[PDB]
Amino acid sequence: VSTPELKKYMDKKILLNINGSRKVAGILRGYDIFLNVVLDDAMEINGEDPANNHQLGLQTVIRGNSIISLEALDA
Amino acid sequence: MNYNLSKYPDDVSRLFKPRPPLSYKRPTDYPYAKRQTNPNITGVANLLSTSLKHYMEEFPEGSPNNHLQRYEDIKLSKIKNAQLLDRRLQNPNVDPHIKDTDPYRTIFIGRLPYDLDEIELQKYFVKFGEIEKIRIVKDKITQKSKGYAFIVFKDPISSKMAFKEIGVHRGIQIKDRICIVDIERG
Amino acid sequence: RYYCEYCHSYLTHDTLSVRKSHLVGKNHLRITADYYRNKARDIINKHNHKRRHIGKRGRKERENSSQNETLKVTCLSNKEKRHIMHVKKMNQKELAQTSIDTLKLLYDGSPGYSKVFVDANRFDIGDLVKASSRSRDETCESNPFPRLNNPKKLEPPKILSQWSNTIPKTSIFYSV
Amino acid sequence: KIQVAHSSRLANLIDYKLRVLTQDGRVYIGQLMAFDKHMNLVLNECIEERVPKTQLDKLRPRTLNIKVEKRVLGLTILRGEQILSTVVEDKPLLSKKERLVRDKKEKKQAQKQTKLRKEKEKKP
Amino acid sequence: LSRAELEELEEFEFKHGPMSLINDAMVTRTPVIISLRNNHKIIARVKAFDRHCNMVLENVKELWTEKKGKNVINRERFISKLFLRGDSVIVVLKTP
Amino acid sequence: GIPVKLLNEAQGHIVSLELTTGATYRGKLVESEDSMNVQLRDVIATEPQGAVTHMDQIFVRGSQIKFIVVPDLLKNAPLFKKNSSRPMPPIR
Amino acid sequence: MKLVNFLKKLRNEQVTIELKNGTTVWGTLQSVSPQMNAILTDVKLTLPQPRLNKLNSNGIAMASLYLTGGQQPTASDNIASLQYINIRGNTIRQIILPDSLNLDSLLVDQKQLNSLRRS
RNA sequence: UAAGAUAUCAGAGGAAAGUCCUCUGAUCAAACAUGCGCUUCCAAUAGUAGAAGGACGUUAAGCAUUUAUCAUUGAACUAGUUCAUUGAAGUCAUUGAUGCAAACUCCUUGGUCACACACGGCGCGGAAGGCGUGUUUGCUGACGUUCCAUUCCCUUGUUUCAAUCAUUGGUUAACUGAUUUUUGGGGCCCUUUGUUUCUUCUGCCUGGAGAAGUUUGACACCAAAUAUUGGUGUUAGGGGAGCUGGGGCCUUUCAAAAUUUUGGAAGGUCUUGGUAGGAACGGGUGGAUCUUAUAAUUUUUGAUUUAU
C-alpha cells in the first residue's frame, strides 16, 4: 500500500541482517513498497573482521522477506 | 527524561514515563536461523502404491456423491428448458392469427390494458391513418387478453407514423396503462 | 473520511499532507498537550473510594474498647478546607519541579564541564538535542585562577517553612 | 473457575483478563482492550509467562510444580501472526448491570458535548 | 472485471487446469494419495475441494512413520470423515 | 483497527519491541506506518543471547515484530472510548 | 466458492480440531469465522504419545499446554481440560468431523445454486 | 486501497425465461422482558481467624550443583603442562546463573446479610452461566425535518424503646391498630479519613446541623500568554404516590371442540420492570458486519513437532 520512508537513509552506509545470521553492509541506493532493497559496494560481515569478511558484487538487490532490521551507521 | 524529541513541551513529555527496561530471559523456542518446517518428506513411494491395494479391496465401491446430483438435477433441467423452447420456435407464417395483409403495414401494440377493447384500440390507432384490420391477441389456453395486438394500416407510412407517435411517446396511455408500440417484428 | 478526536473536528480537504499539517499544527498540539494533562491529575484527584465490609463486633472487644476513652476528632470549616486543599495541591506541584542540581553548580570551572554537563554537546544525547552558547572547544587556559572576584558563594541549605522556628537563634561565630 | 458465555465472540469479552498463546510457547495474560480483522490485540497489564528449558523435562508424562519465569510489561500491542489461541482467565472488575449503567451515562454525556459544541460554533 | 466474470474463470480453472486432476477425481470416484507437509500421507476419496486446495474427504486412512536414532515404526490411523486445510498439502496424485 | 492506530499515538515516546528472532529493542519511536513497521531513535538493542549494544537509528520490517510495549498513560487515550459522538461532517 | 462456508453450517457438533503443532482439541463447536477461526466450548486439548521407546514429544506444545491454565496437577498423562478456546485459523491442520451427519445435505452450497438458478 | 451488499428459505400476488417489489409460512439472529424446587459461588466474632490471588518481598553470600575467552611466536617439560610476548572479538554478573525446599512478612478481592446454637432443601439478595416461552426488530448510532410527548412528595447517621401531641379506622367518654410532630433513654455506625464523597455557602466529636440549587444550566478542576480562550470531569443514592409495561393466579362474559380444554374481554389479588422521551420521514451522514477484488514478499492458505 504505502512506500516505506527510508528517504533520509539513502546514500549512507547501512548494515542489515539477512534472515537469521548473515549480516550485509553496503551503501543504500533504492527501495520499493515490499522493502526489497538495492545497494552498492556490499560486504558480508562475520565474526573475524578482516578475515572472514568478503565482498559480494558491484550491485546487489535484497528481497524484503529476509530483512529483519536495517541500522544506519552514519549520520 | 532529558531530550524529548516530541511535539509536546517538557512537562507533558516527562509525563509519559515508560516502565523500566524489560528483564532479559533466556529463550526457549528455536533460533531464527535454525527454524524450518519438517524437511526429508519421503515421497509417495512405489511401496505406498503397493499398499494401496489393502485400502482398495476394503472400500472398493466409493460412496455416492448425492450433493452432485442436486447440480445434475438443475443443469439437466435447464437443457430441457431449451427443448420446450425448441418446440415453440418451429411453429409466424402459420399461426392463422397473424396472416392478413402486408407486414410493413402492421403495428405491434403492447402492454395494452387487459381490460381494453378493440374499439378503444381502434380509436387511438385510427388517429394515425385508416385501419384495414385489428386483432388483440388472447391466450389460446384460456382467453386472458395477452396485452398485445396487431393493427394493419392501409399504408405503411401511417403505420410508421402511428409507431412514431404512440410508442416513442412514452407509451400511449390507453385506459390506465402505458402502451408501447413497435413494428410487427415477427 | 478522516478526523482527529482530540480536536473533535473533521478535516476539510482530505489528503495525506493536510493530515500532517493538522497532526503538527499549533492548535492541535495545544489540545493534545492539554488532553493528557487532564487525564494525569484525574487518576490522582479521583482517589480510590474503597468499599467497606463491616463485621459484627465481638462481645469481648466491645467491653475492652468501652473502658478505653473516646478521643476528640478535629473537623475544619468549609472555608478552611477549601484553602488547605489549595495549599497541599500546590505543594505537591513543587516537589515535582525541585530537581536538586547542586552538583552541576559545583563542577562549574572544571576541565571537562563543557563535555559532560552542557548536554547539547555530549556524545550519548548530543546528536539529539542539536535537532531540538558554551561550546565543546573550552579548555583550562581561559579563567586560570577561579577566585579572581568571579565566583559566587554556595547558596545556603534550604529549610521547611512550617518548622522554621526550630532553628538555633544565634550563630556560633560572628559573620560579616 | 469462570464460565464464559456459550456463544461469546472476541468482540463481546472486552475487559476480561485473557490468556493468549503465541507460537513459541509464551503466554501473555492481561485485560483485553481492542482487537482487529486479523486478530492482533491490545492487553492492558499483561505478563509474559514462559516455561524455561530446564523445567520442561518435568512436564513429560510419568502434584507437579513448575517454576514459571514471568516478566511484567504493561500495555502491549501484540501482533496477529504470532497468536496461536486464546483462553479466558478472569471476568471484569465491573458487573454486567454496572457496565450498562456506565454506558448510558457516557452515551448521555457524549451527546451533551456535541450540542454544547455546535451552539458554541454556531453563534461565535 | 465483474463478479460474473470471475464465476466463469473459476469454472474454467477447476475444469481445464491443474486442479482438473482433483475435479476429475471427485466425479469419477477414484481414490487419491495426498502428501501433507507433515511428512505423513493419507489415502482417501474426495467429496469436495476448493480454490485454496482444502477439501472434505471420506474413508481416510492416514499413514505416518517416525524415527528416533534409526529405529522405525509405521503407524496407521483410520478416520471416517475429515476436513483438510489446504496449505498443508504439497502433492496430490490420482490413483490408477 | 485500533491496535495500529494506537502505535501512531505513541510517536516520540519510549517504546519497546521484540522481534521474532528474539531480540529486544527499546528506544524513542520516531516513525510508524500502517503495516506496524517502525523507526526507532537512540536505542538499546539486546541480542537473543543477552548481548546488549547501542545504535543511533534503526528500521525494522513490521512483519518481524512480536509485540510492542507502549507508555502506560495511553491506556486512556480516546481510541478506547466505546460510545463516541462525532459531529455532522462538512459537505465536500 | 468458499469451503469455509461448509464449516459454518456444522454448528453445535462434536468435533476434533487437530493443530499444526500436533495438539488435538476435542470439543463443542461454535461460530467458525470466514478465516476459519474456530471457537469451541467444552474442550479437552491433548498431545498424543509418539511411542518408539521414549521419543521426545513436541517441546513447544507441552509448554503451551500447561500455560493455558487448564492442566490439572494430577493429570498423569498429558491432557488439559477447560471451557472456551478461541483458535486462530491458520493453525488448523485437520478437522475430524463426526460420522453421523450427512455430507450431501451440507455440501450443497447456497451461493453455488443461487448462481445457476439466477442465470 | 476499492467496489458491492445489510438474514436465509419457501410459497401467493403485481410489472415461457429471469429480475425487480409486496403479504403469508418455516428456519436463523439480536435486543428486551420473563420464568423455571435449573447449575455454581458469595469469609472467625460463641472469635484475634481463614479462602483466592499475588509480592517485579525477606530469610539469603540458604542448601545442592556447574560455569568464566581464541589465535600467533619463544623457554622449560613429559613423549599433554606452565610462564612471557604479538593480534582478534568481549551484556552485565560468580553475593551470579541453574536445580530444592521451607518459614515469615506484607499487598488486592468479598453479603464479613437475616434467622437459628437447634440429632440427605424449598428465607431476602447480588454475581456468574445453562435452558424455555413471549414481544419487538432484521446491522446499528448520531443529525435534520412534521408530529406525538407533558407528573409529584418525603428523606442523606441508622435502628429500637419510653414519654406526650395531632390525624384516621374498629367497638361499647374508654379501649385497640396505623401514621406524624417535641423530648428523653438504649443499640449499632461515623475511614464520611476534604467527618456524608449530589453540588455551592455557613459549620461540627459536650455532634449527626442550617441556607440556597439542579441540565440548552450550575459546580469542580487543568492549561497558558499578557480578565479572557481552550480542555477533562461531576450533576448521586433511598423510600412513597401517580402513570405505564411484563409475569402467575382467581371470578365473571363470550367463540370452538368433545362437565372439561383451547382463545378473547373485564374486575380482584400477588409479583416484577420502567417512569422522560417516542414515531414517521429525510439525507452526495458515522460506525459495525458480510462478499469480491485477496492463496504472489508486511498478519489468515504454512519454513519453529529439529527431524537426514
Side-chain angles (χ1 to χ4, degrees), chain A residues 12-35 37-39 42 44-47 49-62 64-68 70-73 75:
Chain A
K12 279 74 180 291
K13 192 175 171 66
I14 260 169
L15 195 146
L16 49 83
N17 40 3
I18 302 309
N19 297 124
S21 50
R22 297 183 183 284
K23 277 172 281 189
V24 166
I27 311 156
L28 183 133
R29 296 290 165 202
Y31 56 88
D32 60 357
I33 66 176
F34 307 104
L35 210 76
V37 71
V38 53
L39 44 76
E44 198 257 29
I45 304 296
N46 212 335
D49 283 16
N52 296 320
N53 186 2
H54 65 92
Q55 296 197 346
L56 288 172
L58 187 55
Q59 281 184 352
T60 67
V61 58
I62 306 114
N65 210 155
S66 48
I67 299 290
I68 305 299
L70 191 158
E71 67 160 296
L73 38 80

Side-chain angles (χ1 to χ4, degrees), chain B residues 11 19 24 26 29-31 34-40 70 78 81 84-85:
Chain B
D11 176 44
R19 281 167 182 280
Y24 176 64
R26 203 175 299 105
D29 60 306
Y30 292 82
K34 195 170 180 181
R35 282 179 188 175
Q36 67 191 24
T37 350
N38 189 180
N40 57 56
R70 183 67 182 283
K78 188 61 69 68
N81 190 26
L84 191 274
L85 192 273

Side-chain angles (χ1 to χ4, degrees), chain E residues 4 14 36-38 40 42 47-51 54-58 64 66-67 71-73 75 77 79-88, chain G residues 1 3-4 6-7 18-20 24 35-36 48-50 52 55 89-103 107 115 118:
Chain E
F14 296 153
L36 292 72
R37 211 205 282 226
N38 215 136
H40 65 240
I42 64 100
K47 301 287 282 182
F49 81 105
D50 211 17
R51 184 152 60 189
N54 50 10
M55 40 173 90
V56 175
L57 280 64
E58 202 275 314
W64 54 294
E66 63 269 47
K67 53 179 78 175
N71 298 128
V72 74
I73 190 170
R75 290 184 79 93
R77 202 264 294 273
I79 298 158
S80 176
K81 298 160 185 178
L82 184 136
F83 168 80
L84 190 55
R85 178 91 171 181
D87 53 30
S88 305
Chain G
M1 180 170 166
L3 191 59
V4 181
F6 162 64
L7 275 304
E18 179 157 28
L19 299 175
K20 295 284 172 71
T24 71
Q35 293 92 31
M36 209 180 283
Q49 298 302 327
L52 206 57
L55 171 54
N90 72 335
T91 332
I92 291 102
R93 192 183 292 287
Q94 299 168 12
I95 295 184
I96 304 159
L97 49 104
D99 301 31
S100 60
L101 89 175
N102 60 334
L103 290 77
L107 294 179
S115 66
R118 187 266 310 157

Side-chain angles (χ1 to χ4, degrees), chain C residues 26-45 47-55 57-74 76-89 91-92:
Chain C
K26 198 265 180 180
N27 192 14
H28 176 77
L29 266 49
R30 191 181 61 261
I31 297 300
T32 322
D34 204 40
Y35 176 93
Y36 287 115
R37 277 165 186 154
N38 292 149
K39 304 298 286 195
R41 57 88 192 158
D42 199 45
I43 61 163
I44 303 166
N45 200 4
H47 185 80
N48 54 352
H49 185 269
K50 292 170 79 285
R51 297 301 307 273
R52 294 300 181 288
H53 299 79
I54 308 95
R57 289 175 68 78
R59 190 171 300 109
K60 198 168 74 63
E61 69 174 357
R62 278 169 64 179
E63 294 176 12
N64 301 341
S65 198
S66 61
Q67 69 190 349
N68 297 333
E69 68 97 43
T70 62
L71 294 82
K72 190 175 184 295
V73 80
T74 175
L76 282 59
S77 299
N78 193 21
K79 192 260 168 291
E80 291 181 337
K81 72 178 82 177
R82 192 171 182 278
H83 185 258
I84 207 71
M85 288 294 102
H86 189 201
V87 171
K88 290 170 58 58
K89 193 180 267 67
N91 285 332
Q92 291 179 16

Side-chain angles (χ1 to χ4, degrees), chain G residues 7-23:
Chain G
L7 275 304
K8 297 184 76 170
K9 297 189 286 184
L10 210 129
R11 188 261 187 80
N12 293 126
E13 299 297 322
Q14 293 305 315
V15 77
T16 5
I17 297 178
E18 179 157 28
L19 299 175
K20 295 284 172 71
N21 301 326
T23 55

Side-chain angles (χ1 to χ4, degrees), chain D residues 23-76:
Chain D
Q23 286 168 343
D24 49 11
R26 301 205 291 190
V27 154
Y28 312 145
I29 53 119
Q31 295 203 12
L32 184 134
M33 282 183 300
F35 65 101
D36 209 322
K37 180 176 70 180
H38 43 256
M39 198 189 169
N40 51 11
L41 34 87
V42 179
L43 309 151
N44 192 353
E45 202 280 302
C46 57
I47 311 168
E48 115 168 338
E49 289 184 339
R50 328 172 50 270
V51 174
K53 274 181 181 289
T54 341
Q55 295 282 293
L56 196 56
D57 291 307
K58 209 180 289 186
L59 282 158
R60 285 204 175 78
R62 309 176 65 187
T63 61
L64 88 168
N65 58 339
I66 301 291
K67 180 53 68 69
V68 177
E69 68 193 343
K70 67 181 68 57
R71 53 173 199 173
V72 74
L73 30 123
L75 188 77
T76 53

